[PDB]
C-alpha cells in the first residue's frame, strides 16, 4: 500500500518575551521520527524513531542547520503578517505550516501538499497541482502576489515531487519492520448500569496501528451511529493508538447489540458482543 512523510511547523510570537518560538515535528505515516524546538535546552533536530537514529552526525547537523534557518525565516513571516493585518506590536500570533508527500505501492509519488494557517485559520494553500495558490483572505492575496512574482511554487513543487519522495523512500527502507506493518486492535466490551432501565455498552480498541479505525455499534445488524459516544482516537504513548465507542441501551436489550471494528490490520472486520 502507500505511505506519507509530513512535517508540521508552528511559530509563535511573544512580544516583550523574546523572539518567536519555532517547533517542528516530522512523521512517516502515523510514526513521529523527528522534532526540533527553538526553546529546547540545546535546539537541535532530535531523533524520535530508531530508523533515523542510525543516520550519522552529518545528517543531523544538516537537519539542525535547516531548522534554525527555517525558524528565523518564520520569525520574518510573523513580522510581515502582523503588518498585513495592521495588528499591534504587542499581541501574540501563530503561524502554522504542514507539508509533505505520499507515495504508492510502486514507490512513486502520488501527491504533495503545503498549507499555511495564521492564528488558527486557513491562510494560503498550495493547490493540488503544486503550481497555484488559494488565498483565504485579502492579506493572503498579498502573499499570493508575492509568491507568484517569485515563482515560489516551483521551489516547493521540486522538493515535494523529488527530494521529499527520496527521503520517504529511504526512511521506509530503514524502518520497514516498524513502518510497513499494521497492528490489529485488541478489543473488549464493557458494561455499566446507568439506571433502572438503561446501561452503557463500551467497545474498546487498543494497541492498533495505523491510527485510522472505525468502531460502530449496531442493533439487530443496523447502525446506531447517531446514538454513540465516540472518543477521539488517542496515542497510547508506545507508537500505537486507542479508541472507544459507547452506546446507551435499554436494559435487557444488550444481546441485540454488536460492535463492528474495521482496521487495516484485520483480515476481516470484527463483530463483538458483550
Amino acid at each position: 500500500m502507500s505511505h506519507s512523510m509530513r512535517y508540521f511547523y508552528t511559530a509563535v510570537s511573544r512580544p516583550g518575551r523574546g523572539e518567536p518560538r519555532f517547533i517542528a515535528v516530522g512523521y512517516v505515516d502515523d510514526t513521529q521520527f523527528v522534532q526540533f524546538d527553538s526553546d529546547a535546552a540545546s535546539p537541535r533536530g532530535e531523533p524520535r524513531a530508531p530508523w533515523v537514529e542510525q543516520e550519522g552526525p552529518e545528517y543531523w547537523d544538516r537537519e539542525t542547520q535547516k531548522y534554525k534557518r527555517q525558524a528565523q525565516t518564520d520569525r520574518v513571516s510573523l513580522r510581515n503578517l502582523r503588518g498585513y493585518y495592521n495588528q499591534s506590536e504587542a499581541g501574540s500570533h501563530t503561524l502554522q505550516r504542514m507539508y509533505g508527500c505520499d507515495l504508492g505501492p510502486d514507490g512513486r509519488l502520488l501527491r504533495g501538499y503545503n498549507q499555511f494557517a495564521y492564528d488558527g485559520k486557513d491562510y494560503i494553500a498550495l493547490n493540488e497541482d503544486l503550481r497555484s495558490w488559494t488565498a483565504a483572505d485579502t492579506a493572503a492575496q498579498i502573499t499570493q502576489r508575492k509568491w507568484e512574482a517569485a515563482r515560489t511554487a516551483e521551489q516547493l513543487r521540486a522538493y515535494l515531487e523529488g527530494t521529499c519522495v527520496e527521503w520517504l523512500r529511504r526512511y521506509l527502507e530503514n524502518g520497514k519492520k516498524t513502518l510497513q506493518r499494521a497492528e490489529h486492535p485488541k478489543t473488549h466490551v464493557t458494561h455499566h448500569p446507568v439506571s433502572d432501565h438503561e446501561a452503557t455498552l463500551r467497545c474498546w480498541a487498543l494497541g492498533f496501528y495505523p491510527a485510522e479505525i472505525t468502531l460502530t455499534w449496531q442493533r439487530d445488524g443496523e447502525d446506531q451511529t447517531q446514538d454513540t459516544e465516540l472518543v477521539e482516537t488517542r496515542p497510547a504513548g508506545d507508537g500505537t493508538f486507542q479508541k472507544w465507542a459507547a452506546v446507551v441501551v435499554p436494559s435487557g436489550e444488550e444481546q441485540r447489540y454488536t460492535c463492528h471494528v474495521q482496521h487495516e490490520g484485520l483480515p476481516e472486520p470484527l463483530t463483538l458482543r458483550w
Binding site: 512535517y7 515560489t152 521551489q155 516547493l156
Partner: peptide, 9 residues
Amino acid sequence: GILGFVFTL
C-alpha cells in the same frame, strides 16, 4: 529531511 529553500509570507 526538511525543505532547505526558505521564503517568507
